[PDB]
């Protein structure tokens, strides 16, 4: 029944294979949701940076103006 | 007979495992290429934005200097 | 014996599925670590960034304060 | 020899089990990584919330003073 | 026979470890989804709060400008 | 002979699997309890901080009103 | 002495009683704890329920801030009017 | 006789110590239970609070609306005065 | 005989679990009672807080009425 | 005899379960019923509050009457 | 004879035990229902939030109208 | 006498068995503690080349800001003498 034994072993391999298919699916999901997160991520941080830059510019401008006015009064 | 059906089943398992290997190699390629692309992409954008930040910082410095020189000639 | 040959084939197939399963695991783990790291790094940088910008704003105000004092004292 | 065959099967299973032990480690790792993320994340989220309150209060007091002066001087 | 009962014990053990691996895989999928959802939601709230404060600051600046316009007309 | 060695191997594998079952169930309850605790803690902190934001926002609403009344009685 | 030994015997009986008292405590530790896990389930449900509603109300607070601004406007459009 | 019996007494003393020590262990077990109970109590309290704590959360919008309505009413009154 | 005795032992185990079932029930009821009571007091306490907020607004427009006088 | 006794214990266990069924029912009622009172109960609370405001209004009216 | 009768009783005993087990399973189902009863209680809280408040609002409106009448008298 | 003492010893052994049960409970607590301990948040100190550059860059930006400020101050001084 050697052949049969071999067949049994093959079926054991089969179950394991199903499990690995599932694992692959999980990996795919990870890439998917992680790819979505990193896409949102990077972009949003960049946006923030832009905003901050704008803000600094504004700040500078404002204070310059203020000082000018101060000396205009002086 | 039944052993013939089991031989067909094992051939089916071999085919599915070959598909598993193809998808495994391809998906490794996806992770590796995507990870390298993401790292290079974030490096490019973020270093570019750092140089941009310093560039407009110096540009605002120069514009404060120019406005103050204009004030000197009032 | 044809049957025997097929048994051998099956064994080889099993082997292929097995060592590679280990490989897959490694890929995942390794891969995951990398991913994690990347994410973390990004996040860290962002936080360092924003907060730092806030501080910068505060110090701009501080510069006005010393400068303002100079304008008064003079 | 049947017994021996069974034993061989058992060893294959233990190897799988080997990978299963690795999976347990994986679980652990995952969990802890998540924990870390929440920790640092909740930490600087609370920190940023404190900055939210401080920034709002300080700047509202600032325009309090500015609008006070504006209505006084008109 | 002792060999047959060893075989039955081995089969029971392999079934048990297969159920165990199923449980670990499903639990990893579920809790990975939960963890990434929670982390994404919290960081999304953090970036939203940053935008909330930027919007509030600008809108109250517009508010003060509206007072300036009103006083300029009275 | 070798068969009793195989019996010892199977027994130690069963012992290791029982240890893995204990660790798996224990770590499962760590995930469950930790997830519930994290959700409860973030809910607590979030509700506390939103109540803080609204309450102190109203508080300097009242303080702005009080300062305006004080200016009226100048 | 003899009397003391008798007392010791009485004490032994008391320790038997003590042993009985332990077991009960162990029982308390089991099933009760499982029901504590059910209480935790309830808590979890509640958490799920508030992992968004609170945010809506935060947005609500932003709106409140704007309401405050409006009220302030009213207040300052009053002092000028005297 | 004598000395041997003294040794026996020593053994008895050891037993007494075990009874004492054991009792202390039991006390410790009790401590590890009361704390747990407290935690459970807290959880139940929390549930109630959530509904009612939750009620306070749901009192933060409606109330605001009501205030606004009152303001409107005041405005109407002003119109009546003018 | 022996087998039967073992079965009896199993029954005893079931009765221990049976006791546990009773315990579930009682736990539930107890919990419920306590919970309800405390809960009641709490949402009423908060009604009072809300009342204060509303009451203060009433005071704010009594003032308006005074201005109208 | 012994077997009869075993049967009896089994029966007892079943009975315990049924006692618990009743308990469960009670619990359900408690959960709903009392909470419904939190219904009725808070209606009463609202009423109390309302009364308070009415009283306040009356006071205001008195002040109006005293100019 | 008698002994045999006792054996029969024992089998009946076993049947009863089985029934007890069934009952236990049904009680577990009841527990599931109990777990979902909490959600029904939350629905009751939602109803409390959405009808009594409405009533209050209506009430307010009506009595505000009464105040208007009073104002007309005054 | 002797025999009675032997019986007492047996009782003590039973008590010790109860103590062992308590020890098992303690072990469970220890297992809970094992499901913890270890380290905390990981600290960056590797790869230095890229990560280091990033941090460095941030710092540089800050420094640049400061430099600008200094320059501005200098300008102010110049015109203060003007
Ligand atoms: C490579 C690029 C860099 C190169 C650089 C070269 C560029 C050239 C310059 C042209 C610029 C000139 C343009 C005109 C400039 C006028 C702008 C301006 O100036 O508007 C001012 C406001 C901030 O207002 P502000 O900066 O004045 O506010 C302060 C601060 O509160 C301080 O602390 C106060 O104190 C102080 O007043 P003080 O009491 O006197 O101290 C007050 O100044 O900025 C904004 O508009 C923010 C905009 C939000 C954008 C919205 C959405 C974007 C969000 C999108 C994200 C979606 C994301 C989710 C995804 C996930
Ligand atoms: C989260 C992230 C956070 C980031 C967000 C970004 C911020 C942007 C916001 C900015 C937006 C602009 C902000 C302006 C808004 C604003 O500001 O409007 C003010 C009003 C409250 O007005 P208010 O807050 O000023 O009222 C007080 C209070 O009465 C106090 O006690 C008073 O005292 C004090 O005056 P005081 O005498 O000086 O002390 C007065 O302030 O809010 C509202 O609009 C409530 C709206 C109701 C919504 C309606 C329906 C919704 C209801 C839907 C439910 C249907 C349900 C049934 C379902 C049943 C169950 C299924």
Residue numbers in the entry:
A (entry chain H), B (entry chain I), C (entry chain G), D (entry chain E), E (entry chain D), F (entry chain F), ...: 162 to 235
G (entry chain B), H (entry chain A), L (entry chain C): 154 to 235
I (entry chain J): 160 to 228
J (entry chain K): 167 to 233
What is written in the article reporting this PDB entry?
TMED9 is a member of the TMED family of cargo receptors that facilitate the bidirectional transport of membrane proteins at the endoplasmic reticulum (ER)–Golgi interface via anterograde COPII and retrograde COPI vesicles. In addition, all TMEDs share a conserved domain architecture with luminal Golgi-dynamics (GOLD) and coiled-coil (CC) domains and a single TM domain. Sorting signals for COPI (dilysine motif, KK) and COPII (diphenylalanine motif, FF) coatomer proteins are contained in the cytosolic tail of TMED9. Here, we report cryo–electron microscopy (cryo-EM) structures of full-length TMED9 in octameric and dodecameric forms.
An unexpected feature of the TMED9 oligomers is an intrinsic symmetry mismatch between the CC and TM domains. In the homo-dodecamer, the TM domain was formed by three tetramers, but the CC domain was formed by four trimers. In contrast to the symmetry of the TM domain, the CC domain formed obligate trimeric coiled coils, as was also predicted by MultiCoil. The experiment identified a number of PIPs, with PIP (36:2) containing two oleic acyl chains as the most prominent PIP species. PIP (36:2) fits well with the cryo-EM density at both the headgroup and the acyl chains. The location of the PIP molecules suggests that they may facilitate TM oligomerization. The PIP headgroup between the TM tetramers is within hydrogen bonding distance to the R223 and H224 side chains from two of the four subunits at the tetramer-tetramer interface; these interactions could further stabilize octameric, dodecameric, or higher-order TMED9 complexes. In addition, several hydrogen bonds may bridge the CC trimers to stabilize the oligomeric assemblies, such as those from E163, Q165, E173, Q177, K180, E181, N183, R186, R191, Q194, T195, Q201, R202, and W205. We have detected previously undescribed oligomeric forms of TMED9, including octameric, and dodecameric structures. These and, by extension, additional higher-order self-oligomerizing TMED9 structures, are stabilized by intrinsic symmetry mismatch between the TM and CC domains. Thus, not only can TMED9 oligomers recruit COPI but they may also exhibit enhanced interaction with COPI through increased avidity.
